Structures are given as structure tokens and as C-alpha cells.
């Protein structure tokens, strides 16, 4: 990384600037740089990492779908060539993030908040790879996403209240995984329902701001359940 000569604090400040400028490729590069300094990440810094890469891969996923859709509707080689190019670049970004999680973010994450957050990311990024994967390689990718999500669920169930936004976001995305990737719509539905219900029973314990955070994600759960049922 060319970010080796820049201060950690400066990389973090530049990542915040890049967010404001909607320069997500720069933001990702800055946060990569920050991770590679080797220090654990705070809560705020974990979120900067997440936002940067989610924006970068989201653009690639959207581009991939447009092209893949054109490719299908045309049942010359340019559409396939270009879809493969986008696909390769998406895979590169997924592998970068997973490389960061594996070297040494996850293993240095002692707290439940940090470990579930990174394990959730691991699931998400294997899920994105699974979206573009074909055949048996796909089966292993899928299993890696599930195993990462599952470990995160087990920790969040032991260590976090049911209203915890990270636990809720995890359950939301794991449910999406079941529905869209694993061909288990019933598992998807059960998880979303159960998560929603246990959070609702615990809303009484929250402050006004925590309540707002939890209910925001609870609504996203309900919207999926409505779509799925």
C-alpha cells in the first residue's frame, strides 16, 4: 500500500473527507491503509471501513447485474468480455476485504462488538462472491459465507441484547443470504420473524436514541418479510 508513509490519524481523517466528497474508492484505499498499520479499529473506524467498501462493491454489483442482464437478453463477445472484467474487479475487491479481515482484524478482535462486526463482514463479502460464482466453487463460497455468518450469530446470541443494531443487521443480512443465495426461503423468513419479535420484546429497555436505531433496522426486517410472504 502507498499509504505506508502516511500517519494512521491522517488516513482516518482523509477517509472522513473522502466520504464527504463521495469519493468511496479513495475512502476504501485510506481505510485499507489504516488497517494495515496493524492497530485494532475503534467503533467509528470499523464503520468507515464498512461504508467505504460497501459503496465500492455496491457500484460493482449494480454494474455487474446490468451487464449480466444484457448478456442474458442477448442469449458479439463484448458484453461477456466486459461483464467478466467487472466481475474480476468485484472479486478483487472482495478478496481485498477478506484479506484484511483474515490478516489480522478477526483474530485480534476480542470483544463481541468487534468480532461479530468483522465476522458479519466476512459473510457479506463471501455472499458477494457467491452472487457471481458458478458451479462447485460456488458451493464452497456459499459454505464460507454461512460459516462466517453462523459464528457471528452464535456470538451475538451469547453476548449482545436482541436490540443491538449489529446483531440486527447481521440477522437481516444472514436472512438475505438464506433467501437469495442458499435457496432456503423458509429459513430466511423464520430468522427475520424471530429476530424482529425478540427485538420488539426488548424495545422497552432502550433510550430514545437506541430505540430509533433498533426500530430503523427492525423496519428493514419487516419490509423483507412483507416482500417474502
Amino acid at each position: 500500500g502507498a499509504m505506508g508513509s502516511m500517519e494512521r490519524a491522517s488516513l482516518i481523517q482523509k477517509a472522513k473527507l473522502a466520504e464527504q466528497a463521495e469519493r468511496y474508492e479513495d475512502m476504501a484505499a485510506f481505510m485499507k491503509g489504516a488497517v494495515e498499520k496493524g492497530e485494532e479499529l475503534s467503533c467509528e473506524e470499523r464503520n468507515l471501513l464498512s461504508v467505504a467498501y460497501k459503496n465500492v462493491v455496491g457500484g460493482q454489483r449494480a454494474a455487474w447485474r446490468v451487464l449480466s442482464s444484457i448478456e442474458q437478453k442477448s442469449n458479439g463477445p463484448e458484453v461477456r468480455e466486459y461483464r467478466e472484467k467487472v466481475e474480476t474487479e468485484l472479486q478483487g475487491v472482495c478478496d481485498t476485504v477478506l484479506g484484511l479481515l483474515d490478516s489480522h482484524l478477526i483474530k485480534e478482535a476480542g470483544d463481541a462488538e468487534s468480532r461479530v462486526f468483522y465476522l458479519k463482514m466476512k459473510g457479506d463479502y463471501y455472499r458477494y462472491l457467491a452472487e457471481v460464482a458458478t458451479g462447485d466453487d460456488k458451493k464452497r463460497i456459499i459454505d464460507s459465507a454461512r460459516s462466517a455468518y453462523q459464528e457471528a450469530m452464535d456470538i451475538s446470541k451469547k453476548e449482545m441484547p436482541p436490540t443491538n443494531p449489529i446483531r440486527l443487521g447481521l440477522a437481516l443480512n444472514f436472512s438475505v443470504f438464506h433467501y437469495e443465495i442458499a435457496n432456503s426461503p423458509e429459513e430466511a423468513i423464520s430468522l427475520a420473524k424471530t429476530t424482529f419479535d425478540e427485538a420488539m420484546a426488548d424495545l422497552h429497555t432502550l433510550s430514545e436514541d437506541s430505540y430509533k436505531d433498533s426500530t430503523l433496522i427492525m423496519q428493514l426486517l419487516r419490509d423483507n418479510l412483507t416482500l417474502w410472504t
Binding site: 447485474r65 437481516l172 443480512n173 433496522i217 428493514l220 423483507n224
Partner: peptide, 8 residues
């Protein structure tokens, strides 16, 4: 394609 957690 169903919405996952958005990025705010």
C-alpha cells in the same frame, strides 16, 4: 433482489 442492510 431483496434489500440487505443499506450503507448510510
Amino acid at each position: 433482489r431483496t434489500p440487505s442492510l443499506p450503507t448510510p
